[PDB]
Design a protein around this nucleic acid. Structure first.
Ligand SMILES: [Zn+2]
Ligand SMILES: [Zn+2]
Lengths: 1336, 70, 98
DNA sequence: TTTTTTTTTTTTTTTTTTTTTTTT
DNA sequence: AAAAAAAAAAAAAAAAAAAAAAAAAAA
């Protein structure tokens, strides 16, 4: 088969080659005999016959006349399907411009001639003339002229002057260019020019011209001369039942075009006046514009139905276009759908299948088996027998169904666990019975949510659905290493009720001879389900070298746990089933079984757990009545206290003691406190209230009140969803998001009056609307993410590299949010981890860190691990397997072939439907400081003179547990290495004020300070001290504006005090609005304060992060290390110049004046230091801080957003999306290579080019990495078909055509469209073979 | 009757050579040229091939060896 | 409702609308990622090659299944040819170089 | 008085899955 | 009786990307 797809412009000769006959008339079919109208969009001698092996004239109507052409009518006697391929060609009487190559915003013709698009559209409208090589006499080549100017020029010159208008003039301009000479001249201009905007324009036009020259295209081909016509079948004219014809809009546009062309040719023949022929030419231009791409130039022309008709463009692009409706996914045979039910008797790997639907699906299989068995003489007899539904067909169907998996698939398949293959089990009825547990994976609830079943047909597909997609194989999610078979909401309640203890139940305290005796006692009713007893249990352990050893002991348990123990497999220990067994305990029991035994034991264990949980929940009869919501006895007392408090606060407001805001805050505070008290009283009276006796007075126990059982167990409940039943339901928010002063003090057990219920509808409608729009935004985000990752396929075993990120546990500022184990588990390291006792290493360089290695690390208490990350993988066209790590739903290293890009995209996108002072030390440890500059203050304490100081709590074990960021100028109560106790405020600072603390001591002298010009006169009347306030630039006189107020500290002798350590005198050039309090001749110490200068969403934030959109406040960083200074200020901005001590000085930056600064004109700041302050732009982080910095920032941000809502996403996926995000690079130096100076080239191409150049003696080029948003990181792709599906299609296809690009069908998308095998899954090897046979 | 393929992936690595090898073996068994090795017990060619792979009497190497013998 | 050999469309050879028209289900853009995430290639290949689109392949597998042979002859989707023709209707020339 | 940068303004894309009196 | 295209339509948010026009700010 073919290997690559080429796309390029169409020359008129090529269009002639495609076609098979010109169309000369608008007719379609005769109304009396609906047969092709000659020379009409439906012909017979041009676009093939209408009937198989039959001519239109009917002279030859036999197969034996194959290939002949009937003399009467000239029809080639062939198949009718040839009508699907033959094309025509319409010869325009005038050239017509192609709208795609005219009105695409980077208009190809617009910048080809360097002519403004307005002046081109004016020409196409016959509104003005244009010189066409008129000679260097009086007018220029590209000069435009109006009617009067053209007439004056014609009077001036009759000859040696050529001017025209319209498509003819544009085509002449295109034909008259010299691409090579123009390219050389423009390259010279680019070399000489310096203007950056002019530079970019010249490089863009150079790139266009060079692309044209390299490709076989010619500029004149842009202008349309010969118009191809789609084959008739693709625009059908079928007669609807009853003599009515259904036709597409391509026909209307083509008819319009042919009619206009006929009128134009007739007018030219008749020699009509200039105005009429010009009008007809313009109208033909508009008609062809509508046919090519309707609704772009002018307003879309409608039909008789008053709607914008669909043209070829609308058929290509759009969600209804061929790409996204008939290529990337199509309706599928051997398929069906229905509603679902529970069907708990099923095993984990078989779903029900209605008899009727199953019969319809597997019909060809039934026919094959029947004609094999001989019961059907012919296929028609078999069809009739199946249709009548004979009794023999059922045995055949049950024979076929035996081993033939069917793929169940829900409608929103967000992630790969939304298509799973079960083994059908025939069921009477019309419901697709589905195993209950898998609902958790599907998020399928039996409220009428429908499901589709597909049937794998081929042998390979059957084995695929048997070995990859089976439900029993997906016992572990792709996003995180936790199971996805957690017993969900009813099985869990059954186990919880069945694994419990009652202080005194029937038959408590006897001794049993094992689980069998316990079950036997329970069934007869002699001993209650849960009564404390002693049982002899044998538990097995595999501590030996794969050999199980048993140990028998007389454990103390309940009869319920004794019954449960018969289901747990051999290996697990008894202590797992010796507790309350809620939802976390049971899920962790499943996880322990999976990790200790394997897969099959855990599958059978899950099935048994489900069966027994259902059975014993049934035996419980766990109900819920109106006596199971015990409203607290002290609720009314709390509400009375709250009302008294709010009344007192209102009275205080009447006295004016409290302002409106303060009283509002106090009232909300008291209401929150009262609500919390009520909830606590509720829980105390609900969870422990049950009291019984056992040979004594009384004793308390965990209560069996049904709602407490359904809340504590985690089975469809929570402490939050309760307290709206018994205790008051708190406060409700208004549409603005505010919190209403008066909460609603009635729960659901007591009913809500009119106003309180009406208040409690803002929340409900806000939630419903948020969900309704969140599903849409999440779908869009998932599509973009998976179309940015739709190339990542693991093709290598190891890239052989050392680079990697440094993974460390994350600390928000307080306690650790996530330890090192969760983030590091199942990844390949980058260097030999070594214990704090660095005399020996800890782990090898390239060992997959499984559980044992992580536990060893925890024992040795390591802080950071240099781990290889996908962002750093050195492979091209993929990533090394060792770079990715553990497979996440396989317990081993990733498998060479898994399409990590798609699974990572789906993992990130699925949760989208689940989204929208001082310091206090907690633990006892030693203070540590990182990147800190500090000096002793006037009072003997320590003051930080650095910006990026980080405090850490190094416990006695040497591991950080707490981290803090300190602003500039903070007083430390203690010092580094000083052990401190919990609750100690080691440091404190003022949230307001910006200090200018100094570094020297001595008398204060008024240096470069002038009243009025630099400062004003003001006195703090509160204390009577005169303060020296610096005026702003917009107020101070220009005379003193050049002068910056400063404070040079000197001694009593007049000598200038020099900065400690350094030699420069200490001068602090104060900025505007600085309030110096201390006056002249005032002695000050080091660090004395001179001026106390005064001062998102869940899903949208993730969308912005992956789009890499510059935030509202683009906090600018230190572009280069060096001392700061101010240059020539301008009106709108300040000139900040950063000059290194020994580097290049000239760089400067314009900063808006209103922006707040953080450098006092003398702080030497290294590269990357935040100059402004605010949210960072990821592009800045990538450009300055490197590659690891931006990936770290993105990972941290997205993980914060996700963990905020309690969703886990292993960081590999975000890293993969990041690797795809920053994949392009812009050349800085061309070097010995052959790359343009500023051209933006894919990273892999430049990388391999540089590597293979360095293999030679030539010097490689320098590249600056670039970061592009997901949408733009997708639209700029090597292949054009892959980028032609998910985005603007007109732009992509136009760019591909003009560039003459060439796609090679290498990704996960182009192969999908073309129908060939996939280079990711089972087809991987095949593709490799296809590569190996080639070039061999 | 079969449930899982864990032993199969343990025998043949990559869980993708498994699918292809089982597919080819089942294809030989299905078209009426060849005969099975493991005693058929009412299963289908796919599950029989997976039984052969799991028990360890066939893999890509053995399959190619039996092919080149013929 | 389920379909196995219902009548196909005319413009792009594919199954028809659901239920009353006897059509299949939509293996949509979101249901092809669900397979690519797996190691599923052959199943996807058939799901968008011979189950819906390729004009002769579905008939060939029909006869094979009736003949007891489980295989395919994938060919190329007819909708891809439709897209090629529709792109060629514009002024852009597209072909399949080998 | 010309030229480059930066800013503004207009325009172009995207926005979930399935189920009728009048000329030839 | 077979065919056939004008209109005066007018209308939407929200958000963001990208190209074109306009205004500083010089030397
Ligand atoms: Zn004829
Ligand atoms: Zn690598």
């Amino acid at each position: 088969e073919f290997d690559a797809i080429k796309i390029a412009l169409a020359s008129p000769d090529m269009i002639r080659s495609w076609s098979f006959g010109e169309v000369k008339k608008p007719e379609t079919i005769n109304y009396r005999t609906f047969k092709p109208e000659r020379d009409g969009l439906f012909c017979a001698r041009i676009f093939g016959p209408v009937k198989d092996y039959e001519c239109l004239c009917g002279k030859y109507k036999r197969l034996k006349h194959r290939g002949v052409i009937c003399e009467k009518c000239g029809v080639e006697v062939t198949q009718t399907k040839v009508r699907r391929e033959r094309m025509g060609h319409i010869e325009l009487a005038s050239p017509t411009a192609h709208i795609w190559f005219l009105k695409s915003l980077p208009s190809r013709i617009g910048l080809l001639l360097d002519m403004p698009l307005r002046d081109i559209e004016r020409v196409l409208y016959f509104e003005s003339y244009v010189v066409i090589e008129g000679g260097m006499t009086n007018l220029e080549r590209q000069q435009i002229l109006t009617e009067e100017q053209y007439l004056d020029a014609l009077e001036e010159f009759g000859d040696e002057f050529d001017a025209k208008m319209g498509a003819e003039a544009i085509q002449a301009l295109l034909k008259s260019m010299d691409l090579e000479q123009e390219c050389e001249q423009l390259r010279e201009e680019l070399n000489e020019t310096n203007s950056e905007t002019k530079r970019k324009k010249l490089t863009k036009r150079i790139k266009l011209l060079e692309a044209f020259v390299q490709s076989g295209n010619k500029p004149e081909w842009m202008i349309l001369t010969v118009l191809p016509v789609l084959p008739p079948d693709l625009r059908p004219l079928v007669p609807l039942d009853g003599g009515r014809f259904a036709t597409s809009d391509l026909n209307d546009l083509y008819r319009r075009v042919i009619n206009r062309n006929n009128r134009l040719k007739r007018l030219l023949d008749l020699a009509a006046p200039d105005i009429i022929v010009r009008n007809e030419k313009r109208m033909l231009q508009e008609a062809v514009d509508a046919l090519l791409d309707n609704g772009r130039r002018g307003r879309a022309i409608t039909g008789s139905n008053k709607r914008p008709l669909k043209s070829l463009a609308d058929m290509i692009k759009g969600k209804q276009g061929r790409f996204r409706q008939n290529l990337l996914g199509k309706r599928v045979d051997y398929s069906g759908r229905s509603v679902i039910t529970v069907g708990p008797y099923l095993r984990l790997h078989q779903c029900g299948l209605p008899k009727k639907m199953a019969l319809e699906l597997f019909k060809p299989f039934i026919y094959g088996k029947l004609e094999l068995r001989g019961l059907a003489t012919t296929i028609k007899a078999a069809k009739k027998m199946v249709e009548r539904e004979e009794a023999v067909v059922w045995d055949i169907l049950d024979e076929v169904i035996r081993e033939h998996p069917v793929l169940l698939n829900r409608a929103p398949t967000l992630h790969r666990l939304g298509i799973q293959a079960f083994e059908p089990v025939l069921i009477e009825g019309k419901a697709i019975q589905l195993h209950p547990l898998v609902c958790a994976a599907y998020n399928a609830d039996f409220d009428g949510d429908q499901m589709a079943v597909h049937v794998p047909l081929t042998l390979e597909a059957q084995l695929e659905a048997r070995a990859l997609m089976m439900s029993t194989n997906n016992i572990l999610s792709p996003a995180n290493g936790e199971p996805i078979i957690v017993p969900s909401q009813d099985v869990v309640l059954g186990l919880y009720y069945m694994t419990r203890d009652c202080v005194n139940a029937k038959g408590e305290g006897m001794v049993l001879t094992g689980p069998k005796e316990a079950e036997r006692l329970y069934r007869s009713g002699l001993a209650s389900l849960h009564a404390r007893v002693k049982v002899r249990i044998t538990e097995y352990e595999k501590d030996a070298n794969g050999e199980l050893v048993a140990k028998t002991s007389l454990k103390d348990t309940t009869v319920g746990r004794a019954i449960l123990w018969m289901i747990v497999p051999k290996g697990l220990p008894y202590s797992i089933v010796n507790q309350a067994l809620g939802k976390k305990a049971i899920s962790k029991m499943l996880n322990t079984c999976y990790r200790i035994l394997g897969l099959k034991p855990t599958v059978i264990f899950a099935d048994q757990i489900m069966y027994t949980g259902f059975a014993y929940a049934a035996r419980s009869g766990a109900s819920v009545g109106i006596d199971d919501m015990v409203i607290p006895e002290k609720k009314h007392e709390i509400i009375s206290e709250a009302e008294a408090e709010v009344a007192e606060i209102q009275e205080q407001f009447q006295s004016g003691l409290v302002t409106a805001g303060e009283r509002y805050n106090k009232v909300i505070d008291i209401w929150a406190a009262a609500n919390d008290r009520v909830s606590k009283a509720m829980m105390d009276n609900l969870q422990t209230e049950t009291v019984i006796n056992r040979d004594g007075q009384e004793e308390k126990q965990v209560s069996f009140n049904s709602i407490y059982m359904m809340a504590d167990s985690g089975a469809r409940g929570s402490a939050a969803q309760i307290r709206q039943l018994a205790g008051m339901r708190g406060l409700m928010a208004k549409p603005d998001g505010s919190i209403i002063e008066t909460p609603i003090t009635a729960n659901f057990r007591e009913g809500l009056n009119v106003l309180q219920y009406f208040i409690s509808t803002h929340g409900a409608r806000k939630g419903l609307a948020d969900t309704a729009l969140k599903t849409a935004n999440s779908g869009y985000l998932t599509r973009r993410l998976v179309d940015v990752a739709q190339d990542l396929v693991v093709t290598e075993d190891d890239c052989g590299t050392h680079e990697g990120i440094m993974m460390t546990p994350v600390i928000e500022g307080g306690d650790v949010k996530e330890p090192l184990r969760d983030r590091v588990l199942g990844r390949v390291t980058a260097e030999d981890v070594l214990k704090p006792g660095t005399a020996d290493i800890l782990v090898p360089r390239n060992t997959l860190l499984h559980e044992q290695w992580c536990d060893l690390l925890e024992e040795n208490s390591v802080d950071a691990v240099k781990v290889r990350s996908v962002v750093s993988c050195d492979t091209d066209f993929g990533v090394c397997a060792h770079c990715y790590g553990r497979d996440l739903a396989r317990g081993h290293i990733i498998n060479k072939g898994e399409a990590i890009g798609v699974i990572a995209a789906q993992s990130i996108g699925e949760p989208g439907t689940q989204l929208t002072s001082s310091i206090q030390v907690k633990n006892k440890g030693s203070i540590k400081l990182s990147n800190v500059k500090s000096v002793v203050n006037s009072s003997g304490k320590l003051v930080i003179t650095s910006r990026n100081t980080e405090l850490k709590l190094i416990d006695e074990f040497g591991r950080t547990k707490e981290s803090y960021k300190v602003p500039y100028g903070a007083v430390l109560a203690k010092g580094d290495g000083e052990q401190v106790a919990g609750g100690e405020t080691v440091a404190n600072w003022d949230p307001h004020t910006m200090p200018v603390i100094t570094e020297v001591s001595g008398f204060v002298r008024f240096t470069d300070m002038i009243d009025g010009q630099t400062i004003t006169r003001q006195t703090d009347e509160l204390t009577g001290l005169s303060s020296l306030v610096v005026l702003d630039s917009a107020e101070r006189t220009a005379g003193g504006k050049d002068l910056r107020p400063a404070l040079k500290i000197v001694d009593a002798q007049g000598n200038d005090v020099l900065i400690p350590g350094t030699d420069m005198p200490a001068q602090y050039f104060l900025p505007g609005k600085a309030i110096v309090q201390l006056e002249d001749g005032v002695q000050i110490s080091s660090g004395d304060t001179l001026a106390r200068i005064p001062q998102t969403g869940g899903l949208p934030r993730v969308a912005d992060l992956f789009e890499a959109r510059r935030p509202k406040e683009p906090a600018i960083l230190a572009e280069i290390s060096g001392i700061v200074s101010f240059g020539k200020e301008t009106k709108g901005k300040r000139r900040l110049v950063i000059t290194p001590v020994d580097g290049s000085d000239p760089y400067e930056e314009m900063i808006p004046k209103w922006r707040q600064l953080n450098v006092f004109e003398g702080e030497r700041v290294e590269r990357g230091d935040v100059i402004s302050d605010g949210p960072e732009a990821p592009h800045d982080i990538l450009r300055l801080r490197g590659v690891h910095a931006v990936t770290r920032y993105i990972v941290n941000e997205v993980q914060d957003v996700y963990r905020l809502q309690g969703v886990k996403i292993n960081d590999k996926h975000i890293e993969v999306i990041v690797r795809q995000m920053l994949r392009k690079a812009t050349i800085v130096n061309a070097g010995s290579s052959d790359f343009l100076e500023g051209e933006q080239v894919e990273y892999s191409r430049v990388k391999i080019a540089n590597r293979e150049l360095e293999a030679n003696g030539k010097v490689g080029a320098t590249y600056s990495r670039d970061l592009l948003g997901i949408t733009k990181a997708s639209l700029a792709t090597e292949s054009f078909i892959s980028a032609a599906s998910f985005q603007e299609t007109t732009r992509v296809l136009t760019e591909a055509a003009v560039a003459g690009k060439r796609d090679e069908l290498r990704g996960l998308k182009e192969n999908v469209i073309v129908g060939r095998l996939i280079p990711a899954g089972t087809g991987y090897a095949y593709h490799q073979d296809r590569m190996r046979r080639r070039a061999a | 009757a079969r449930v899982t393929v864990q032993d199969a992936v343990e025998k043949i690595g990559n869980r993708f050579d498994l699918v292809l090898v089982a597919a080819r073996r089942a294809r030989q068994m299905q078209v009426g040229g060849k005969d099975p090795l493991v005693p058929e017990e009412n299963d289908k060619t796919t599950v029989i091939a997976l039984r052969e792979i799991e028990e360890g009497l066939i893999n890509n190497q053995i399959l190619d060896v039996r092919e080149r013998q013929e | 409702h389920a379909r196995s050999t219902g009548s196909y469309s005319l413009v792009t050879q594919q199954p028809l609308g659901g239920k009353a028209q006897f059509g299949g289900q939509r293996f949509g853009e979101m249901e092809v990622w669900a397979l690519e995430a797996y190691g599923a290639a052959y199943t996807l290949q058939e799901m968008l090659t011979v189950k819906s689109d390729d004009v002769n392949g579905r008939t060939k597998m029909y006869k094979n299944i009736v003949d007891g042979n489980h295989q395919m002859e994938p060919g190329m989707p007819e909708s891809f040819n439709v897209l090629l023709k529709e792109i060629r209707s514009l002024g852009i020339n597209i072909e399949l170089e080998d």
